[PDB]
């Protein structure tokens, strides 16, 4: 269902927004989950270019720079 | 109601016809004012899942 499928989101910063904050932070903090951004919701929180539209050129070019050298 | 409104706005409505008309208005306004909230909640869940 729509409300159930939105529950699962890779970015924990995104999940901490519309879900119950306490549980999300705990459940993520124990596993040491590493949020790579890559999404919209999370990038809005941190205040950088949305990885879409005008920003899509930027993020794309940065994403490839990663896992390289 | 089994006794409709036999008059219209060009003529006058008597006491009863208006009083009976009131529920339709108030229920109309209430329904919309609630349907406003329903729409918003829907968009929320939708944009969250996409």
């Amino acid at each position: 269902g729509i409300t159930k499928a939105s529950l699962a989101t890779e970015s924990f910063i995104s999940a901490a927004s519309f879900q119950e904050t306490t549980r999300v932070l705990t459940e993520a903090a124990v596993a040491g989950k590493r949020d790579e951004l890559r999404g919209l919701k999370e990038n809005v929180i941190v205040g950088r270019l949305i990885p879409a539209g005008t920003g899509y050129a930027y993020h794309q070019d940065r994403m490839r720079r990663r896992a390289a050298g | 109601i089994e006794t409709p409104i036999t008059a219209n706005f060009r003529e006058g409505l008597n006491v009863l016809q208006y009083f009976i008309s009131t529920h339709g208005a108030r229920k109309g306004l209430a329904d919309t004012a609630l349907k406003t909230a329903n729409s918003g909640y829907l968009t929320r869940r939708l944009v969250d899942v996409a």
Binding site: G1, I2, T3 | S39, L42, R45, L46
Partner: peptide, 22 residues
Amino acid sequence: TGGLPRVADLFEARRPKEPAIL
């Protein structure tokens, strides 16, 4: 049934009360 709540039930996948079987 029908209306805006009907849409919400559809997108919510909710199983009807007395469903059929295939």
